[PDB]
Design a protein that fits this description.
It is classed as membrane protein. This is part of a larger assembly, with chains A (about 40 residues) and B (about 100 residues). Chain A is about 20% helix and about 30% strand. Chain A has one helix and two strands. Chain A has a two-stranded antiparallel ribbon with strand order 1-2. The longest helix of chain A is centred in the first third of the chain and has 7 residues, at about 10-15. Chain B has helices at about 1-10, 15-35, 45-55, 60-65, 70-85, 95-99. Helix content of chain B is about 70%, strand content about 0%. With about 100 residues, chain B is an all-alpha fold. Classes of the chains: A alpha+beta (about 40), B mainly alpha (about 100).
Chain lengths: ~40, ~100
């Protein structure tokens, strides 16, 4: 059975449901790799 | 569960992840067996397919369910009510499969 209610508010119900430091994961010879920092 | 884990580790594997695929495949088989003994032997099939065709239309829900970093509890929260909506999901085993 398929829902045709088109009541996708559920998505909004999660849209409504929802400082930056990264971490060095490897380093050497003047190069580093940094996990995290999503908005660099 | 520990017995099936034992008989699972009892064989060699191509890689690391394939074992996780095998175990969750076993979970799938068990949920389907529960459904088959419940008399829903094929209702689960059409339920899965219709939900798949529903999810196919919406790329938003589809892709953001593939959040490779959000906590798995966050993922199941995402699924909860968009699945638990109405008669469109009357099957009581498909909930655990999709979860």
């Amino acid at each position: 059975t398929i829902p045709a209610d088109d009541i996708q508010s559920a998505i909004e119900e999660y849209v409504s449901s929802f400082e930056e430091v990264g971490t060095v994961v490897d380093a050497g010879d003047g190069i580093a790799h940094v996990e995290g920092l999503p908005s660099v | 569960t520990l017995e099936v884990l034992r008989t699972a580790v009892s064989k060699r594997w191509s890689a690391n992840s394939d074992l996780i695929d095998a175990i969750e495949h076993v979970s799938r088989q068990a949920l389907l067996e529960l459904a088959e003994r419940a008399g829903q032997v094929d209702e689960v099939e059409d339920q899965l397919f219709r939900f798949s065709r529903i999810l196919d239309v919406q790329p938003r829900l589809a892709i953001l369910l593939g959040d490779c970093a959000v906590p798995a509890e966050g993922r199941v929260r995402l699924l909860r009510k968009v699945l638990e909506r109405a008669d469109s999901t009357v099957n009581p085993v498909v909930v655990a499969l999709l979860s």
